[model samples]
Target: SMSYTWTGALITPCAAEESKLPINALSNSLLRHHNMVYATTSRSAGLRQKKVTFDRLQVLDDHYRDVLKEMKAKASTVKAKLLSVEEACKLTPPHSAKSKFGYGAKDVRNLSSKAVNHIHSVWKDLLEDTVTPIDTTIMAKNEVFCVQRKPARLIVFPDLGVRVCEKMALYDVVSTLPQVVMGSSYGFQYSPGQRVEFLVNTWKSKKNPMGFSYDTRCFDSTVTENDIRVEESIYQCCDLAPEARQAIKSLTERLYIGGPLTNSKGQNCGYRRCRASGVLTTSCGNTLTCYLKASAACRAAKLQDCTMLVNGDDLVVICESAGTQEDAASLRVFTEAMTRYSAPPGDPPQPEYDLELITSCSSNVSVAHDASGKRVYYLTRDPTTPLARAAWETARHTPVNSWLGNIIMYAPTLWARMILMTHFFSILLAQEQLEKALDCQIYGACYSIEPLDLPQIIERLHGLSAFSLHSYSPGEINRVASCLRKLGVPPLRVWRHRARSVRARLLSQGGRAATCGKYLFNWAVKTKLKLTPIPAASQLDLSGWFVAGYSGGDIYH
Candidate 1:
């Protein structure tokens, strides 16, 4: 029987932190935020910003081009003066007006009037394209509300500092000291939430080694009611299975209550704690408690084993003792349990048959069926021959003197009986010479040729006078010709062809003498094709039709 059911068990992490808070809480918090950033950017928030930036850059480029054309065209008359004006104009409009002092028609018209107008127009257009104003009240309302939150902070420490600081340092100092602080030491110096970027310029220049490090550790700080409950459950279970109780009980019975401690000098020792005393002392702390807990766990395991054995054996016996119909149904469940546990280490191949008592019931059914048909039964069961014999013996012991046994015995063995009857009936039906010849003809035609040729061949062989073999149409004749070709003979050619042709036909059909001739021909051909009468010197040379060797050590030639 096959079971398609599964049960899931919650897997607890083996090395859980003793405290509710992680060891490096700050580092863990930093990692959490880093992961959040990654998650958001992964969702295409960064890509959306990049696309908007690109679009804005294109608009800025067009505005700059228009400004460049105006500046280039306006200052052409006084070449040196125009060049000075153009250089001043390189500064953006509003700033350029304050930077230079000048009085000219171009200055008044182009700078005061046109440039001011253009600057104002560009500023308005840029505001319209790039910025959107939102109501502060509505924006606040749309902000997500989370149940629990932790304060985010960046803590930093110098490599040589004994303690971490609440704030990051003002200056980057990694390059100044490479000996005391290497890359491997980076993780220890930084606090959570700090993002350090390495500065290679300073380190490369003055041969001063620099290191930049950031700790991005994350701890899951959010706790639910269920999390607290599970934690309490673990602590309670630990106390319930404590080791101190078992250790004290064992020690009390073995030594403390048994006799007084004595030294090897045959004197009752006043100071029993001395090394010379026979008594061993151990601290009565977590060690003793752990031992007691282990002892309790072992006892619990033994109880579980006993319960499983009793339940499993009872189920097995019930399934096996039942009759065929009930046994088949009940054994499905029993066999499933057997397979679940009996699976070899690392999932080796499943056994074709179950090893349990259910096998006894199945073997009994097969044996009973075999006996009713008067067939000889052989025990070809696997998983050890002795176990198979035991199962057979149990099946034989099952009562066969009842009404069910009689019925089973009387049930008709139609399949086997019919097969036996058909064999003798066929021999009796082929008594006449014509019947025997027709039988041979039918056999040869059915087996030797394609199935379509059977009708004509049977008609001819049966001596049916009304039918003519030559009456076959061209298509039918071609089909028959193909069959004859496979047979390696033509019926008409037997009388028409000469002796040599007949001999050739016989040789093609692989007659005994023709087979010998074929062997002789193959031998001669192989001899002519041989590269060497003796074996080749190297395995690589065996494939060659002829071998050639060079004077040098190389075998290629």
Candidate 2:
């Protein structure tokens, strides 16, 4: 079956889209090549459509079935709860698109009687009719990047009412099921510190580790009806309430299987047979399907002692190597197996003997020395996209700030500390909004975070050592250096100089701002301050911070 069938109705945009990077006074200070920064818009949807539309072929064998049975056995132990209307409404992001009905996101959050009434009706209708395909909006995501010129990513999502209904049915299942079934391989279950620890320990546990990341070209598009149905069967294995079970089954058949894709202007764009990018189950479904295919493929390839770390469609496998020659041959077989299973790679897989070189979830583990010269392992990635987005955010206000998220997730990295923090903090200090709570997403959930609370947040998520980390690995340094040069970002020396100035301004403000200066900007000074655990760090209720991935789930906390 085709992934999509068009009705000749064009995919249209709802608002004005910016394709080029908007420059500001602070842009040159961070990056000079303004032309390098670009944003993808709906104009490139045709290109994206051409790339994503394809026929899928799935070959499931005993190995795949065996893995499924194992996952189902683990899933059966879990008991999932159904969210009430109010609970589901609270999960909706404040800036989420307004319902076609008169109510909006704020109304839902405030428990407006009209919104609550409609939600109840929607849930009731969901239980009543399990066969009608739910309607979804298809739009091209306007994302900032550095001159790669990739077409905009497509997002297909149902109405606010249906989105809320999805949470009602599957929020608990999505949050708790993956960790139980996949265990340590569930990548969203760990913070930055915990993730690096998992990777390092897994690498050391192997006698001769060979690892690789399997990139599924258009993973969402490759999803077939059988795959979605298989995922529902696994979910049905869980011990769920009667109503919850029925809701899940209905959602699977009506929504998850396939649906109509309406454009922003209310035109019928096409129909999608692939996985809808925006839904409560998108993350969980992708993780399960990817893990199932890869686990089967590993056995087929005759790989040894494979340990998979999966986050949605991002997969990394570290296994005992059968010598370099055999490992390379095994990866080819693995790629072929994955291709047959409908997840062909954009870039062919290569066997990596060094754990640090195997990137997953757009991050790689790297070493840096903390204050006492103790070796510390942390996650880092290329700064191209983060820097470009920061420059964009500097010039204009966006819904969620990627820089803050990058700062939190990659707090211990050289590029994050020297470049991201230095640039963003200086701007915040200038605007006198250091204490303002801004929105950022972590593991795909939105949170209102204050810049002043960064020191404590970093302490809680990474550790006090994150503040004092220095003398990074040569590989990590070179990657950051090369990324800066390519993106026309200033060198680390210039950032250090700028950080000293930002540090001075922050210190002059006193209170939480002063704390940020002492801890966050300690690297810029000649003499570093003695870092200690923040008292507020322990007080923060960050229970679900590292619990699950919600990328397009419209989750808010």
Candidate 3:
């Protein structure tokens, strides 16, 4: 399930070759409704960024010492042990990309001689050579942007062997330790449901709640080599075993410091100038350093009444709105402080009266409907790459379901419920003879999944709200319409049409098959039954399945 890198379709969903906007009435109506306050969406390509390293000596005062002390205190509570070779072997998924070492993922899972030997070598390399930086493979990620709508972005990641070794050495620590040190600031600790709840509660609590998102242009690239070392300093504060400490230090020097950047064409394109996106520690390193920088910067600017919610470099601050003039000036001061801290705003920071207007995680408010025709204002995004990769999974074999992240994030939404579920299950049905269950990564870990558990899964992940609430902002409704049209996904009306027939067919198969129509298309039911848990769903480590601290099939949240 740790398999990274997307290797499938060249399909990139974007603005159709020519301007098809004015001709389509539906798209035109939706686009007009947006009141799009179009911000500059272009990334800066003019800058030649310099490489960063971990050689600077940190001056530890009481504040730094206090952080280290608390980390050590929490580390005292962490009893994470090294995973066994065979146990770590099983962590490799059947569909994981084969190693360059000539052993496949399936071979590793079966504990074949070549695989075990190679894995041991990988593990041994971590302990033996601490200076050689780990090399990563870079791939292009296809997606749809708001203005440019370009098909691809370059994604960098580690080799399969190093990834496996990463799991053995630091997975548990990353998943467990951060939550203890940073508490709610630890992004992975909260479910999407929790995040939304916090947002709604925080907004309601404030008198005139002003929320804004900070766009740190090229956030990963902005991370200096010192920022990474600072994160490692926090990690090293933990009381680890002798061998574990050596492995971590070695990994930090080799992998985390900076590595050679390899392109898709198999060329040593250039040296990585900043934080590489493809490593396991990337998220942890980004969040820790970003939070530290923002907190320091916010304090220096006297930014108060703010509740910071950070997920990697993406940040949203909901604070008491000072008057318009003051808020505008405050943004300037905030930008200055952040610039000094090395995470300057990509563009000018924006403040908004509405929460939905600020997009974080590339998701925004949108509208959909249930069986009763009630308007549903749920989060939605362009399903371009998801649909592309879904097609990839159906044709080939990938360790992950592209639809899983959507299901977790927007599980209650109309598009997710009817279309994504129907399409993916439709593919599953074609595959048939469901010999093995698949996995969907939600909070950066994996969940063993099957179609039958849809009902329980839906209710557990989202509440009864999935079937009820309705209403949306104009911008939200507009984006939903535009996204559906551009992505060529049929309207909700079309999905409703498909579901009625799909419901009947699923009922004929019975058991889990019978559930597709009920839980998935709940609003269609004259009478609704509670989504009770199945045997497998009943026994999940639901809170932290994605956490690296997960033991042999069990979990430590």
Candidate 4:
């Protein structure tokens, strides 16, 4: 619906060579007689290229309340630490947007008097006023396509004043609650196998099996003022420091409610009526509200076994399939109830008769080569944005880069270890940043990692099994090759070629290197040595890393 209330861009997969016109995949698939279908849901017709837009209003009431109560209970168990203002300030990346005023994040972290004074003013402004929304800017997220690569848009507006407060109020709650409540249904907890096993088992357990995805038009944008308030209500139920509650209360009144939209060149863009993009509450809010609406709507719609996995606004329904015709009817009824409750569908929401149509968080089951040169089935996706974000950090030093995030979650993927690690180490090699031991998340928590640590990193991340599967499925190989061509990423051969240098480089300069050379380069070397064990790697708790869930790893957590 193209109304003043809503507008959108038509984001579709296209060929990498953008100079040529895009041949939409919706049609291209049909030529192969794969009988490709763009799904039709309650929102819009699916045959044509659907427009991804922001304009729908969110409805919140009893359905929202029910979810809040459950989430509130789980959050209660967690004793959340509110970060000290200074600690929160330290987390602010140095490359964060420069303030027009004299204090930027870098200045604030260094305890600049002007920055502190400015921060105090901002916090006070939030407490004093109730209408002005926080300022937001636009950022395009790069997404890898099965056919091509592209950048996706996200509207970002972070409150520097309340953001620190979120560390105290919502950080632990977001990370810990879903996993606790949903248990294995939490998408981040699984690897591809576990995700499928969960789906299969859940489906088999149902008397009448049905599965489908729920698509909400402009999910983030659809979150209303009421929705934010409802989220705040849930937050209030948590046992928090008095100051934390006050900060959250002020944030709800002054900023969380909505805000001004600003563009890159300092022009006023528009007003926000939905969730602002860059906030600590973004993940928690969407997940809680979505589950709330869906859980309630499942009952209202009379769907059984309404177990759902939500990643932000993208939703999938794996209830009773109810056959194709009946499914159409069931979805309409479900959509009406959801619209009444305010949770809508995104493009990923579709019914799957086969495994191919199912995808979670842009990841679906695919096949690739393991180290033993076997093509094994695993979870894989395009590397477009991983490189895009890596370039941003490699060029601008924007805090932590995407590669490290991917490393923790996708350590087993060939692209991850060979490409991401290779690229990351090469940069660190040049910058002299690789020599020092660094720490990052393994499975779910943190551990120290170094250039010499690949054997342990790989073994822990478990690529030995990942890299050795005999042969990938034909569908997977086709898609991977197509994606390789479309994204302009080099074939795996080139990565292997590059790894030799990265491996060689990591081995140099004694204390400066060779141990890593001895370890990370072992497979390529003729002489294999029993490397010293990463002591921490052996004794560390590792219950978190393995699972089968969504396409993206626990990077969100």
- What's the TM-score of each model vs. the native? 0.11, 0.98, 0.78, 0.71
With candidate 2 superimposed using the best TM-score fit, by how many Å does residue 34's alpha carbon deviate from the native? 0.5
Question: Relative to the unseen true structure, what is the C-alpha lDDT of residue 538 in candidate 2, on a scale of 0 to 100?
Answer: 73
Clashes of each: 8, 0, 3, 34
Candidate 2 is scored at a TM of 0.98
Candidate 4 residues 66-170, lDDT tens each? 766777687666555555656556655444555666567667567677766766676666556656556655433332223222224443555444554455445
Worst 10 residues of 3 by lDDT: 37-46
- CA error at residue 288 for candidate 2, angstroms: 0.6
Question: Which is better, 1 or 4, measured by lDDT?
Answer: 4
lDDT, candidate 1, equals 0.20
Ranking by lDDT: 2, 3, 4, 1
Mark the regions of model 4 whose C-alpha exceeds 4 Å error after superposition: 1-81, 120-154, 172-184, 188-210, 263-267, 346-348, 353-357, 366-377, 383-400, 417-433, 436-455, 461-470, 487-557
RMSD of each: 43.0, 1.0, 7.7, 8.5
- Full-model lDDT for every candidate: 0.20, 0.91, 0.60, 0.56
- What's the lDDT for residue 404 in model 2? 97
Best by lDDT: 2
> Which pairs clash in model 1?
28-217, 28-218, 175-210, 242-293, 243-289, 243-292, 243-293, 244-289
Ranking by TM-score: 2, 3, 4, 1
